[PDB]
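yo

u said u wanted the structure for the complex thing, so here. seqs first:
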Amino acid sequence: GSHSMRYFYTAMSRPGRGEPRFIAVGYVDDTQFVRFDSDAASPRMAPRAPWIEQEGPEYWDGETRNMKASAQTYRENLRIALRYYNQSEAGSHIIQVMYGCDVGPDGRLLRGHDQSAYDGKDYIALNEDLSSWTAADTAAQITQRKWEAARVAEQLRAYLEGLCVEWLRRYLENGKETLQRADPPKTHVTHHPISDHEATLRCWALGFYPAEITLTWQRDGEDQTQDTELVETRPAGDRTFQKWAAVVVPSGEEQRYTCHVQHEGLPKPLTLRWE
Amino acid sequence: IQRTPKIQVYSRHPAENGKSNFLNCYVSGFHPSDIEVDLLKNGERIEKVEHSDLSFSKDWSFYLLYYTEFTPTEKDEYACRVNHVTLSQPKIVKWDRDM
Amino acid sequence: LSSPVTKSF
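structre next:
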């Protein structure tokens, strides 16, 4: 494939501590490329990856313009939601939005998304037909009817099918040496005695991209999933990812245990033992 | 709705005593977004702590990366201090080079 | 590029 572009808006009210904060991040697959924070010294859409910095003033001014209008829209939306749910102006509330497009290997739109949450529950969502909405409650039904009336789905369909797909094509080309070039994990097994009778085996995958990875332990075959301590994949802080999988083994059994790594960047699946 | 933060303390690169590195604290799976994350050296707060921009997963729960430049040593203990509305008193997680 | 589509509730 792959491939995807996503924007994540967070609009948070903070009564008595100024106006709501608005934060927007843009991703292409597992890589952040743009950010916007209404609490910055001078609000602007800023680059987050090396391949986007090559954009011109018009791109940045244009995006900053769009984010400032969105910030205000979602400031209004917070006031609106407060009357839909009949809540006080004393409490902090949150709107989240995520939208974007997925394209196949040929660059054709596979799937578009546009979802909203209020206080962390699904609020309203664009259906895959890109023409109707699913509303989670009767308050979202009010919003739904407004968007049917305003033909919001038709405007958003055109964005997902046009601009969103066109720009992802540009981004994928401009960042092809990282976004389309896969980073295999560096791997190694460590051995730490717990007691005289037990030892931990930990399998490491470091500096890999994309984030997707499978890391399993086996004992002569087959899987030891229900006994493996697996940490959630984590960012290294340099655009790449980290993961480990641990298993507590009886002393004398360490040679029966194999680690197995699956990742797009590896041409062949890895088998590792402690040495 | 509330969700308590999952927390991971680790380094950017394999820990090698004396060698430059970055210390990471990764909070994820939390809601609402207000969170107070500090990294420590021997119990005391480190000054220059950068963080990634706030984002969230498919389940709407937020994630953040706090990092700082550090030099690992045989003596110095490093930790992460996290505070959230779901936490009765802050949660400390020590950095372990094997973790 | 973000959406220019106003989403008022």
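The two ends of chain B are 31 Å apart (CA to CA). Residues 4 and 88 of chain B are 11 Å apart (CA to CA).
cya
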